[PDB]
Amino acid sequence: RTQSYTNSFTRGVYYPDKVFRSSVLHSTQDLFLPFFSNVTWFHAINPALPFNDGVYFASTEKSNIIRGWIFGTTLDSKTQSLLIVNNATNVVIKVCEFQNCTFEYVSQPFLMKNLREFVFKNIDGYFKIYSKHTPINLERDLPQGFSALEPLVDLPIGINITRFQTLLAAAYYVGYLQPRTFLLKYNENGTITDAVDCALDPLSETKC
Amino acid sequence: TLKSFTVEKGIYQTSNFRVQPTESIVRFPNITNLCPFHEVFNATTFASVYAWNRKRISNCVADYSVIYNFAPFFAFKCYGVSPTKLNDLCFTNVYADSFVIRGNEVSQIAPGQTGNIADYNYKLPDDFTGCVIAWNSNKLDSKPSGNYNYLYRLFRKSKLKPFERDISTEIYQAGNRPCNGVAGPNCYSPLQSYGFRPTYGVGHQPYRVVVLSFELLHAPATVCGPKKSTNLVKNKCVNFNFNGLTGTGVLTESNKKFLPFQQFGRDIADTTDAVRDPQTLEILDITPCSFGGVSVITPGTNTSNQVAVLYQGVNCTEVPVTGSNVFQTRAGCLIGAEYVNNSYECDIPIGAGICASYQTQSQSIIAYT
Amino acid sequence: MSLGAENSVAYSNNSIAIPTNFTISVTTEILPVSMTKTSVDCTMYICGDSTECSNLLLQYGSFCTQLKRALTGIAVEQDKNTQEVFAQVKQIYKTPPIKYFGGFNFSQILPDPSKPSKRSFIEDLLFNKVTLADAGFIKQYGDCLGDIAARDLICAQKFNGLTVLPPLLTDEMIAQYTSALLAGTITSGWTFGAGAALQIPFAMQMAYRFNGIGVTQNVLYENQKLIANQFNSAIGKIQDSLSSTASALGKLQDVVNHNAQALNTLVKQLSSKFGAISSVLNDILSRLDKVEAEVQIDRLITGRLQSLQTYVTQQLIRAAEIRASANLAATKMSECVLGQSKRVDF
Amino acid sequence: STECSNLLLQYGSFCTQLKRALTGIAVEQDKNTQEVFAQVKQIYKTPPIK
Amino acid sequence: AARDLICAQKFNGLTVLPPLLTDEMIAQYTSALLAGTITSGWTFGAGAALQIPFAMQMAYRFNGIGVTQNVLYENQKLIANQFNSAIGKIQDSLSSTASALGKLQDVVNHNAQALNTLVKQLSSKFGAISSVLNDILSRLDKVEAEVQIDRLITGRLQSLQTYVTQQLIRAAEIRASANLAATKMSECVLGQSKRVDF
Numbered sequence A: 001r002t003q004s005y006t007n008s009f010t011r012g013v014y015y016p017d018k019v020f021r022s023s024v025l026h027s028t029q030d031l032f033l034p035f036f037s038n039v040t041w042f043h044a045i046n047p048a049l050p051f052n053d054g055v056y057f058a059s060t061e062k063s064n065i066i067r068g069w070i071f072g073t074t075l076d077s078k079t080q081s082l083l084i085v086n087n088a089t090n091v092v093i094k095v096c097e098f099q100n101c102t103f104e105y106v107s108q109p110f111l112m113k114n115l116r117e118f119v120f121k122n123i124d125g126y127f128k129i130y131s132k133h134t135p136i137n138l139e140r141d142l143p144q145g146f147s148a149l150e151p152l153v154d155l156p157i158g159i160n161i162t163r164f165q166t167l168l169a170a171a172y173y174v175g176y177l178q179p180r181t182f183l184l185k186y187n188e189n190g191t192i193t194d195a196v197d198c199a200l201d202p203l204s205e206t207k208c
Numbered sequence B: 001t002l003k004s005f006t007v008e009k010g011i012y013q014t015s016n017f018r019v020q021p022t023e024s025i026v027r028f029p030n031i032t033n034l035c036p037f038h039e040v041f042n043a044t045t046f047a048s049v050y051a052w053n054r055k056r057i058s059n060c061v062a063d064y065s066v067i068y069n070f071a072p073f074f075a076f077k078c079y080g081v082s083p084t085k086l087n088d089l090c091f092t093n094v095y096a097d098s099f100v101i102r103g104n105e106v107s108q109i110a111p112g113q114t115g116n117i118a119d120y121n122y123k124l125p126d127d128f129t130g131c132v133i134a135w136n137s138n139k140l141d142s143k144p145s146g147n148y149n150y151l152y153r154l155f156r157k158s159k160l161k162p163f164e165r166d167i168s169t170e171i172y173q174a175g176n177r178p179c180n181g182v183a184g185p186n187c188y189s190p191l192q193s194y195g196f197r198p199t200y201g202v203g204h205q206p207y208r209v210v211v212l213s214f215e216l217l218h219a220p221a222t223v224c225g226p227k228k229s230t231n232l233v234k235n236k237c238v239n240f241n242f243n244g245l246t247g248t249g250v251l252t253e254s255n256k257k258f259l260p261f262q263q264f265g266r267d268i269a270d271t272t273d274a275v276r277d278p279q280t281l282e283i284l285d286i287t288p289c290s291f292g293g294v295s296v297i298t299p300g301t302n303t304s305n306q307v308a309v310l311y312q313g314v315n316c317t318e319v320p321v322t323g324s325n326v327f328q329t330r331a332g333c334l335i336g337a338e339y340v341n342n343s344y345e346c347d348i349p350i351g352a353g354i355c356a357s358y359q360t361q362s363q364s365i366i367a368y369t
Numbered sequence C: 001m002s003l004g005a006e007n008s009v010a011y012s013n014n015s016i017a018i019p020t021n022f023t024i025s026v027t028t029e030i031l032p033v034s035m036t037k038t039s040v041d042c043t044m045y046i047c048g049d050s051t052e053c054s055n056l057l058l059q060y061g062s063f064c065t066q067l068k069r070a071l072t073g074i075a076v077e078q079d080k081n082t083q084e085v086f087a088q089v090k091q092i093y094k095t096p097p098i099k100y101f102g103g104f105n106f107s108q109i110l111p112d113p114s115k116p117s118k119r120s121f122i123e124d125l126l127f128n129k130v131t132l133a134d135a136g137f138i139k140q141y142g143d144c145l146g147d148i149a150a151r152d153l154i155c156a157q158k159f160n161g162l163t164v165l166p167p168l169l170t171d172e173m174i175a176q177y178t179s180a181l182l183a184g185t186i187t188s189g190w191t192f193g194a195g196a197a198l199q200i201p202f203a204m205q206m207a208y209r210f211n212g213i214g215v216t217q218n219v220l221y222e223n224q225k226l227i228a229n230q231f232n233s234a235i236g237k238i239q240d241s242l243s244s245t246a247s248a249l250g251k252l253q254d255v256v257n258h259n260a261q262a263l264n265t266l267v268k269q270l271s272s273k274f275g276a277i278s279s280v281l282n283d284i285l286s287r288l289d290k291v292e293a294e295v296q297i298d299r300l301i302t303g304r305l306q307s308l309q310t311y312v313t314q315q316l317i318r319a320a321e322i323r324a325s326a327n328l329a330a331t332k333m334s335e336c337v338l339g340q341s342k343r344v345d346f
Numbered sequence D: 001s002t003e004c005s006n007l008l009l010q011y012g013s014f015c016t017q018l019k020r021a022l023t024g025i026a027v028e029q030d031k032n033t034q035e036v037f038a039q040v041k042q043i044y045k046t047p048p049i050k
Numbered sequence E: 001a002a003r004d005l006i007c008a009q010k011f012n013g014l015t016v017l018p019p020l021l022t023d024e025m026i027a028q029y030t031s032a033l034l035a036g037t038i039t040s041g042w043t044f045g046a047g048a049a050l051q052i053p054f055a056m057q058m059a060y061r062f063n064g065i066g067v068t069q070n071v072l073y074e075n076q077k078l079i080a081n082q083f084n085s086a087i088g089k090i091q092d093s094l095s096s097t098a099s100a101l102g103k104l105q106d107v108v109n110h111n112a113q114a115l116n117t118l119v120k121q122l123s124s125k126f127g128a129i130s131s132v133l134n135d136i137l138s139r140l141d142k143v144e145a146e147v148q149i150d151r152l153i154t155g156r157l158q159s160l161q162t163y164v165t166q167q168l169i170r171a172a173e174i175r176a177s178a179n180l181a182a183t184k185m186s187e188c189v190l191g192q193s194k195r196v197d198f
């Protein structure tokens, strides 16, 4: 697995709550992704990737090499482990807490020149998944613009996750989430069209 | 309003008129299932506090008022809500956590405390909402030879996160020598067993604790209590109860483009501008009922007892909260004074270029420019 | 920073400098007179149709009576300021239909009857250059009753109990006062401010002004066309400056914006918890029982009462400042317009 | 104090308008000094004869 | 070891911003106004500066106040001696008496005293158990500590609001005095005044 480093280019915002607002500038402190961050590109033709308060995931492989994810402290046993393995025929979010099963959950919607921008969050025993698909031209690097992410699935796990691993030729971008305050601009229809990172530069500090 | 018996000539703003609600509507989702609180509060045994079970409850008609008939407990100790107000409003999901501790640590089941249970067995968050139930079990979980089926964890490297478990049994490293799975000097087992006996004091007796954790209404409501629904009405000032959200207003169709994951719509000053109906998937607006201000225009009480009423800021095809005179002004409109096509000096000011006065040639209150 | 260009006047004990020509300069001075008149309903602002909140609010005494009295005093004082500034003429003079004043051209400061409102060219530019909002004047509840997705800020300001009152003197009446003062000044000089108006030709009136400032009247009478040309060019320069530059009316823009920011802050203070568990009174009354609910409602009542008292204190200070500026404007009107002033830089 | 800051964030926008009032006073003082002293357009000088 | 009040004012978050115009620039403006009103009459206040002899400028001032200029031109040495004696007398009066600048002394003293009172207000308990915040954090648990913290926040916020209101009223009074001083600079210095006791 080769590892390259690239730029985020102000991508990866999401709706912070399930309420509606129109033409109102609103400030939110949450687990966000900083603008112009050092997002890490992986090409797989393989250690466990570190987990630190939510992971942003992007991919361009349309033939579904990246199937699922395996979480936990260790790999197989001796701790509390997770298994969110998915396939392509039917979309299943089958979650196992075998390591002695204590949490099982299945539901349909996880998956539906395309960006599958995902955000995984683990706060206070609550696991939240944000997902958004986006068309792209000039598929190298990351596009410039704004495309918000929407809430998909919540789960009551109730463990630690400190390591995560994708399930596999493939190329994907992994970005790391930090607690951060954003200033989001709601449109007339309720669409997030613009956002200001409140701790990026003094001009954005003045804007906030 | 002036706290006097004599009122001199002028204009006085007095109170506020507001149209009253006529009926009340309650909207609840159609749920007929009964979730089993009975199987949570009746069990042969409860799990240990290091291995506390968690039961998720949704799609229920949660009857809370019957919970006092299943277990003999004094205080239904709630932290976020009221114990007697659980049958009206409703939630998203319920979580039930059941375990057994000793009587010295039952005060430790509280948001934001430091000890043994709250640090290494069961930690509650600082923003915790829900209720805690505790009752004595000296006749069920105590043995004269010693009941050792209940254990708890007292050694750990770090304090527990809120709402998480740690059931791994590894030998504690209390020094520098490696334990290698063998207990002895500076290598202690993390689980220590309770030693419950019926001859102990009241503080060492075993207590059964059931914690109900609630989630606020931000998602679509899955569990709601036994309140009967009411048929929907529109274009009238009504008292509405939408999934426990109580308000007063008038409902209209909304052309707002709500997303499928959004249930509420918010204003600048935190007011519910729009609501999604739980039974049919429809978006409704909330507008407050008609209001304004009332001003009384009078001469002195030594002159006459006739007054005029100015309703401020309202169009007055809607007056109901002499009486045959209504003149439309810019500052609301005027009832009780007639408009003339003349011009004098301003006696009592009213609004944008309109004044009022008392005239003799029958005496009456007239309004002019 | 630079204090200015350095100069060194050549002074000796037998040398003088005497002017040989002149210029006529027209300058613009802008003064605020009155501001937005507001009224606040305490029960609607704090409680909003809640009998428990009203019963808790009734134990705090008479804070809201003196708040309403202070706001009523400010609202009366604004109309008093406008009347004191403008209503200084006793009869509404009008210009005769002949429009010759010795070459001077007042066609573009005098009103024209073509427009529905009798406002002149410069008055229309000043009324358009200031972005004065409608401020909930023409039936704001009837406007907010419509099914429009663009929810106005004035809708929330009206719904929270904050009402904006209309002034006693409308813009047509203010323009009529301005037209009467202009016609009286042009047709009679200073004689209409000290009794009945006495007619005088405008060239001889300007000769009286020249003799007042200390120049003999033959200087005007031998330079009348030049002085008329300079005056017309100066008035055209004022119109070009007011057409191009939009930053001259910053005082009136600040007068609008301060009231807008104050009402916006008073609306936005309703979303704060103030130490309670929620900022929604009905949510508190639904979640909690009587005693604990009364505790949280008392906390919210104290916070909202503090916000209202802060708003009233700032309104009183701004009303004092606006009253001082209106008194200065009234003195400037009575001295500059109704006569001739010898005061330097006044 | 992080806890005191967290309970200070719930009291609204009192401190923003306090900062706005103090900034207005600080601007107004220099406006007063400018409008009192800076009234001459140029800087004059006395000739060396006295 | 001697801690000043300014050190505690800075350490408790009350700072003082410097003015935009320094004393050198204020003195340069004053010197420019003096040079204009000595070497050019009043004409610099009504356009370009026009030079004029000082005896003739005194003659114009005498003719303005209503005395014929021969009274000046026959008593020039006496008037110069009287003016020099009056200048020396006001110099000696400012050298001796120190109770004349009480207005500016009060302007300094009010803004010293308000910050001293604001710093002194931090030592109060406001109904809590300790005025020190870290004592409450070290001694009590979360809920009761939040109660005492809320009492301290309410007291200190009320004190800060009182200070801001007093500063706003003093700013209004200072602005009125500055407007009067600007009018006096426009009318006395740049011209000749016909107003009695102005």
Ligand SMILES: *[C@@H]1O[C@H](CO)[C@@H](O[C@@H]2O[C@H](CO)[C@@H](O)[C@H](O)[C@H]2NC(C)=O)[C@H](O)[C@H]1NC(C)=O
Pocket: C020, C021, C022, C226, C229, C230
């Ligand atoms: C005083 O100034 C005016 C304007 O500043 C002079 O009028 C100008 O005269 C020249 C030549 O006579 C013309 O080309 C200009 O068009 C005139 N200007 C205007 C606005 O009419 C006037 O000549 C000056 N007087 C003296 C004695 O120099």
Ligand SMILES: *[C@@H]1O[C@H](CO)[C@@H](O[C@@H]2O[C@H](CO)[C@@H](O)[C@H](O)[C@H]2NC(C)=O)[C@H](O)[C@H]1NC(C)=O
Pocket: C105, C107, C108
């Ligand atoms: C008095 O002023 C008016 C208004 O500026 C002058 O009218 C302008 O005349 C010019 C030249 O004919 C036109 O280009 C403009 O369109 C006119 N403006 C308006 C508003 O009518 C007028 O010429 C001036 N002189 C007089 C009346 O002698």
Ligand SMILES: *[C@@H]1O[C@H](CO)[C@@H](O)[C@H](O)[C@H]1NC(C)=O
Pocket: A005, A006, A007, A037, A038
């Ligand atoms: C990301 O970090 C690496 C560290 O070696 C650096 O080389 C690279 O330039 C960074 N990317 C940026 C700043 O976009």
Ligand SMILES: *[C@@H]1O[C@H](CO)[C@@H](O)[C@H](O)[C@H]1NC(C)=O
Pocket: A073, A160, A161, A162, B158, B160, B161
């Ligand atoms: C997860 O377990 C590790 C043990 O190596 C521990 O360091 C960490 O604190 C645990 N996670 C959390 C969120 O506390």
Ligand SMILES: *[C@@H]1O[C@H](CO)[C@@H](O)[C@H](O)[C@H]1NC(C)=O
Pocket: A187, A188, A189
């Ligand atoms: C909102 O949506 C409508 C139709 O869906 C569209 O016509 C309008 O332009 C949108 N508003 C924006 C993009 O600001």
Ligand SMILES: *[C@@H]1O[C@H](CO)[C@@H](O)[C@H](O)[C@H]1NC(C)=O
Pocket: B030, B279, B280
């Ligand atoms: C609840 O009501 C809706 C609308 O009438 C209906 O579509 C749905 O099937 C109902 N649910 C049940 C369980 O009857």
Ligand SMILES: *[C@@H]1O[C@H](CO)[C@@H](O)[C@H](O)[C@H]1NC(C)=O
Pocket: B042, B043
């Ligand atoms: C508790 O519930 C079980 C359910 O089968 C029942 O058999 C048992 O009798 C109940 N306990 C008591 C004390 O009634």
Ligand SMILES: *[C@@H]1O[C@H](CO)[C@@H](O)[C@H](O)[C@H]1NC(C)=O
Pocket: B315, B316, B317, B328, C139, C142
């Ligand atoms: C509101 O008032 C205006 C002015 O009288 C009137 O023309 C209009 O019809 C009114 N609107 C109604 C009655 O809906």
Ligand SMILES: *[C@@H]1O[C@H](CO)[C@@H](O)[C@H](O)[C@H]1NC(C)=O
Pocket: C012, C013, D049
């Ligand atoms: C007048 O000015 C000249 C040149 O500076 C000087 O020599 C002369 O002494 C002055 N007159 C008097 C009386 O001082």
